[PDB]
Structures are given as structure tokens and as C-alpha cells.
Amino acid sequence: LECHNQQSSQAPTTKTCSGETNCYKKWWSDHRGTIIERGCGCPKVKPGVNLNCCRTDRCNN
């Protein structure tokens, strides 16, 4: 699957994974502002950080 792996609001990017079927997209609002990360899988996090898995191409755009 061609998911996304670009942190912050920098120049987007695309890549393929060899194993995981679903991806995700996490983000939060720190003192610095708002940040967003991606990755192939569906982990969890401690209260305070948002995250959501998906099974669509560039779903974590």
C-alpha cells in the first residue's frame, strides 16, 4: 500500500510497505503548535495524543 510518511506540514511523500495492511495518522497540539506523524500499523497512545488507523491509500494524508 502507498501510505504517507511526512511529518509536520513539510513536503508530502509516498512509500510502499511490505507487511502491514493498514496505516495510521497521529497528531496533537503542543506548546509549539500542532504536529502529525504516520506509519504502517495500528498502535495506541496515552491520553493527550490523537491517532487513527485506516485501510485506504494516502488515508493518513
CATH number of domain containing 15: 2.10.60.10
Residue with cell 511523500: 13
- β-strand pairing of 33-40 with 23-30: antiparallel
d(CA 24, CA 16): 14
- β-strand pairing of 23-30 with 14-16: unpaired
Domain that holds residue 6: 1-61
Cβ atoms of 40 and 17 within 8 Å: the answer is yes
Q: Please, which experimental method was used?
A: NMR
Number of domains forming the structure of the chain: 1
Burial-class residue 22 by CB neighbours within 10 Å (0-12, 13-18, 19+): middle
Cβ atoms of 51 and 35 within 8 Å: the answer is no
